[PDB]
Amino acid sequence: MQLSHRPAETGDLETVAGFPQDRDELFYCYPKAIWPFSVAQLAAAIAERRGSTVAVHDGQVLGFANFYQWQHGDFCALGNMMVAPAARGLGVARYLIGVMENLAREQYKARLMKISCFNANAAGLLLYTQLGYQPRAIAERHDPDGRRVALIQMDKPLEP
């Protein structure tokens, strides 16, 4: 469907902060955040990151992403990837990741995009696989209940 993108704005914060539907979803897209998510937590992430971007369809903000890490000439890492629940499965994240890949290439001369995905997040793992990301390593992490989870580190070459 028809999608556009632009930098995130203050008026987008309340909608975007509403995207994660439970503690698990919040952990998957922003593991340092604390449930419940809030506009203050989102604004703080935006201020300390780069490239915060929204995807819009039919006047609705449906998706958000930024760079978790950025290293000129080297790589960027995708951060805070989240989509409105009613709009999932429709290509919003696919679209926005394409946008972020282009931004990494153009703004950071990145050769590689990194994406890390928690093991329980099948939807994420499958999407990133469809976009050409390959798994490289697995790291142990802990969820908010102190349970041990596996963070799967994936990457993809970008090219000029």
Ligand SMILES: CC(C)(COP(=O)(O)OP(=O)(O)OC[C@H]1O[C@@H](n2cnc3c(N)ncnc32)[C@H](O)[C@@H]1OP(=O)(O)O)[C@@H](O)C(=O)NCCC(=O)NCCSCCCC[C@H](NC(=O)CNC(=O)Cc1ccccc1)C(=O)O
């Ligand atoms: C986005 C979403 C997954 C997808 O958005 P879509 O808009 O919905 O995606 P389409 O573009 O439509 O494409 C979807 C594709 O997948 C196929 N599909 C399969 N199953 C499906 C299903 N059930 N449903 C739908 N689709 C399913 C489907 O067929 C299609 O493939 P084809 O049909 O096209 O082939 C959507 O469902 C979402 O928002 N989920 C909730 C949030 C979320 O999980 N976000 C991803 C985060 S991974 C990124 C995490 C970045 C994390 C980062 N930190 C790090 O990296 C590392 N720091 C740390 O660890 C620090 C730390 C601190 C404390 C303690 C431990 C550690 C950061 O802090 O920011």
